[PDB]
């Protein structure tokens, strides 16, 4: 049983980062050298190494995916702070897996702006690792309660990226896949293609 | 104080986007994040 990584990496539409998607991968064999060898702008593994992956077996693999700005890709790493790591998608200090990204300007930019991809600009506190906040409450920035209406110091919490193809590369959309490799006290049924 | 300029920075972010300066709007978005992280 081949693992459905193509359905993660070559999916037609990606999620907004604040509402990032998670896919559980299980009971299958995956060739990870096929991954490391599409054109990727980021590929960093933390508790593992790509060549070593093709011989390991895991209980589950979780594939989280979303779109962010090129300059924000660096925040998808353990120990990072910033608008994306604080308020949208947070990795733990002890992350075990890989962070993979690529430029998706051809797919996700549109003349006049693609407003389908959002991020969260305001939040009272930072996310916990792998927490997902999809609320759309008006953010109270000032002293007066907002009562559900945007206004002076009362801000709708999400913004659209508005990706356009003429943007600089640091402002262009990037598709990101975060692979979590889970090893519980349980049968390890997701196996590299050179597994014993 | 801090609240007045935060509001004017928010308004410039929105106006930049409505007037076709989306890239500039994103840069002002980054300033709003950094500004609000301060005490």
Author numbering:
A (entry chain B): 334 to 370, 372 to 530
B (entry chain A): 1 to 39
The authors write:
For engineering, we determined approximately 2 Å-resolution crystal structures of CeSPIACE or its intermediate-stage peptides complexed with the RBDs of several strains, including WT, Alpha, Delta, BA.2, BA.5, or XBB.1.5.
CeSPIACE formed a two-helix bundle and homodimerized to form a four-helix bundle with the RBD-binding site facing outward; a similar dimer was reported by Khatri et al. We introduced notable interactions to form a rigid helix bundle; a salt bridge between R15-E19 to stabilize the helix, K2-D39 interactions at the edge to strengthen the helix bundle, and a cation–pi interaction between W4-R38 to maximize the dimer interface. Surface plasmon resonance (SPR) analyses showed that these interactions increased the RBD affinity despite not directly interacting with the RBD, presumably due to stabilizing the ready-to-bind structure. Superimposition of the crystal structures confirmed that the RBD main chain of the binding interface was perfectly aligned, and the main-chain structures on RBD surfaces were invariant among various mutants. CeSPIACE was designed to interact with Y473, A475, N487, and Y489 via L3, L6, Q7, Y10, and M36; with R498 via G20; and with Y501 and G502 via G22, E23, and L26. The binding surface composing of G22 and L26 contributed to binding to both tyrosine and asparagine, whereas the previous A22 and M26 reduced the binding ability to Y501. M27 improved accessibility to bulky residues Y505 and H505 by extending the side chain toward the dimer interface.
